[PDB]
Amino acid sequence: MIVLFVDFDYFYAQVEEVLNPSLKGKPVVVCVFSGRFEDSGAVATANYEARKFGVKAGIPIVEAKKILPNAVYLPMRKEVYQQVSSRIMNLLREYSEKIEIASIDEAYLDISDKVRDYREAYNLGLEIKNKILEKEKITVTVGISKNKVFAKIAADMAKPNGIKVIDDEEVKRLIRELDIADVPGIGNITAEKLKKLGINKLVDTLSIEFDKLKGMIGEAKAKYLISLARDEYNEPIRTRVRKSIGRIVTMKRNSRNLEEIKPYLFRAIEESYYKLDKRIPKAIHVVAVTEDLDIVSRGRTFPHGISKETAYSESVKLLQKILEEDERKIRRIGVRFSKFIEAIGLDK
DNA sequence: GGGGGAAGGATTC
DNA sequence: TAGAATCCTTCCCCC
């Protein structure tokens, strides 16, 4: 198998640059303004000019401005980025029918039927980069290898505006030398659980007792890492199906008052129904974010689709259930719909 | 901030 | 070698 992974560079900020070329060269910071107070909210993403100085996805807007007070701060326009994204994804389908859209700015292509070696792979990766730049004026990074995991790793090492092949030999090298923290699916919590077991590299997973590894990180991640370390990871390129659609809104103040919470919960419903488009959910979950930023969830599955009116009445009953079973104050409130009428995937 | 999947407990066959 | 499928909420990751 030969996988070609495409990752659009600093995507949201780059789209803003395309729509407003005067922004080119300047630090651009795309933000999610929460509405609590002035510049409350977080950075969604920043271009490389901003990131260079430490302004990155996840930091408070307040903190970003301390670092770069003169950067351009823009509100996230997801609808806009989604349309640009859709156009680029359509362009990629012209290079392979075996395509996996992993997110708004990431897609895997199985080009095993298209190319014979990694030299032609690299060439095809150049063609794709060139095509996206000419049609949309978007630069991307291409990662190429024998599977999805290493194709992603290649892109991670080569971004931005890059292209990298990790051949069979380099795959073996990385198994020995790559910090296991840099493997997709291993976040800070898993990395620390692993380090306490003495696993720092993929190769280390093969010598540790399996039940020790499993007990610590779960059977799934254990098997996953071992399959990688054995150079036997194979996961096919498959069409991802949206399984849930929702919205969580931040309230003006923390609250356990049903009447004060209701309007926010109802706005989340309205937005969520808009997003659903033609999808009809059979399941609804109310999701509360507590004052200490914990997450509490209660849901219901119906043997039928949920009308907006049923969503309204059920959501209150579910929020009442949360209020009863958790004494903490609620900071954010929202709703998530799933179990869509009519096929495989499409719900949870 | 949205959203997917696995962990782990409970249920039921 | 081994309860195991399934449903539910929490946990963890990532984009």
Ligand SMILES: Nc1ncnc2c1ncn2[C@H]1CC[C@@H](COP(=O)(O)OP(=O)(O)OP(=O)(O)O)O1
């Ligand atoms: N707190 C948050 N709020 C909203 N969206 C967030 C977020 N944290 C992350 N995201 C989302 C929004 C953007 C994305 C950030 O992840 P990458 O850095 O992988 O994507 P890109 O921006 O293209 O940078 P490049 O790929 O060139 O490194 O995740």
Ligand SMILES: [Ca+2]
């Ligand atoms: Ca990207």
Ligand SMILES: [Ca+2]
């Ligand atoms: Ca990591």
